[PDB]
């Protein structure tokens, strides 16, 4: 039924059934945040710049008070202007509900205020001044249609609202839900999208995502032409074009094939007995067969993460790693953790864990390091294999771990509510504020929630440490790189001592394309957007760059910095402005 050449078929982004289209619900559906709701400004990792999207510009009143001016054209899909009240509303709702976009804003933002119809003002909290979070929450604030949400709240609990009626859906992005059922989710373009004159219309009229049960079935679909825009783990992906001559590609045409997405962790629930012991978590770190698993199970699509949680694939981040502490701690040339069952057993022995007759460790207090599961979603075959290789090694050191692979939604439920034992999951990636972002996401108790309550915002492992809080509250009280640095280095000491969870590998930014119906995909040859994976939070510009094969169109002129004749503002220009307002 869908017009094939006017539709982008997608894979690897939606796993399990659709849920809601409500970022305030416990779970929501792929596409909701990506395409339905846009921010004031879109961070562009590729260029280290910011696209003014819903906002046309900012002004620092002073260094702690930022005003953001909404484009006059910015307008919800129902014709109601997007206004400052929508910005205030979205954030206040998140604080009230304990869930929603911009979780944690109130920790570092003193107030968000609508100073006029199209003018929002954000003010940094000065007690725990943090310029990075001040900028992050404000520039990337996503408004929500207050006039919509208020009426829902009159009628039911917000957290229960589904938002699944297409004709009632009210969005800021260029797409909204068209149709769904147990086997597919489909979005349709908003042809009179407010952003049409500034940004153009995205070329696909439809985004469709057939719900595949597992990797092999999605891959088969991709091999046969049925997926244009894929975000999948695929084994030996190069074979698709090198051997099978299919019209498909990836970012790179040779080894890594994928750019990095972020840091994949073996998360260890700190609230469970045994797993609550830093010694046990440290022993787990030495028992991960990093290289063999990344080579065999991950196909070299990504490499071992540094234990500082800093993504050292990028030269600019390396200054934030205390290499002398890491090398001294782990005895390796760059300070990575070696796979070493001897050390793993040694750590366990020197903490007084002793194998019982069944081979499973018991601690000096009688805690058995056993039955635990390590879990990832069913059908995520790369992660499943990695789980099996990890679980085998843990068992041999007397930590009784078995794999379990439930439906994505079940897995997500246990992850977010902190009822898992071990999992592999994601965290965050390269960003203007990186390494801060990952410490904030993984280690900060203030973004967690009690066991049994959902968090998407951070610290699934329920790590609890007041010192980290204090260091995050201090790390960017001034813009002096050296101050960040020292806070980062101290957090690193704490990480090596507590091993809150294990940074294991750099996740791949899964991204594959077919040129059968759509061309001008972003790639190393055509590096127009650096987050093109269909599931990425920041995927949307990809849809403005591709063209129908039957009608090639040039790359949008708004891409590129201001000095290149685009509309994007360098991060350096924003800090220059911040500085200048001091
Ligand atoms: O590599 C693990 C699996 O990753 C899947 O993509 C994930 C997205 O759907 C998810 O929501 O975001 C994470 C961030 O790490 C992605 O890894 C692939 O679709 C699967 O094929 C793959 O096995
Ligand atoms: Ca969004």
Author numbering: 1 to 582
What do the study's own words say?
The periplasmic binding proteins (PBP) are a protein superfamily that serve as primary receptors for a diverse group of metabolic solutes in signaling, chemotaxis and metabolite transport systems in bacteria, eukaryotes and archaea. PBPs are comprised of two α/β domains connected by a flexible linker region that serves as a pivot point for the ligand induced hinge-bending motion that this protein superfamily is known for. Unlike other PBPs, the tmCBP binding site is bipartite, being composed of a typical PBP solvent excluded disaccharide binding site (subsite one) that is adjacent to an atypical large solvent filled cavity (subsite two) where three additional saccharide rings could be placed. The structure of tmCBP was solved in the presence of β(1,4) linked sugars, however the size of the tmCBP binding cavity and molecular modeling suggested additional glucan sugar linkages could be accommodated in both the disaccharide binding site and the solvent filled cavity. tmCBP is found in an operon that consists of an ABC transport system and an endoglucanase, the natural substrate of which has been predicted to be the algae-based storage polysaccharide laminarin.
The crystal structure of tmCBP complexed with LR2 was solved to a resolution of 2.05 Å by molecular replacement using the previously determined tmCBP structure. The overall fold and conformation of the protein is similar to the structure of the cellobiose complexed protein (all atom RMSD= 0.4 Å). An extensive network of polar and non-polar amino acids and water molecules bind the LR2 ligand. A total of six tryptophan residues (Trp15, Trp380, Trp383, Trp426, Trp510 and Trp535) form van der Waals interactions with the two sugar rings. In total, ten hydrogen bonds can be formed with the first sugar ring.
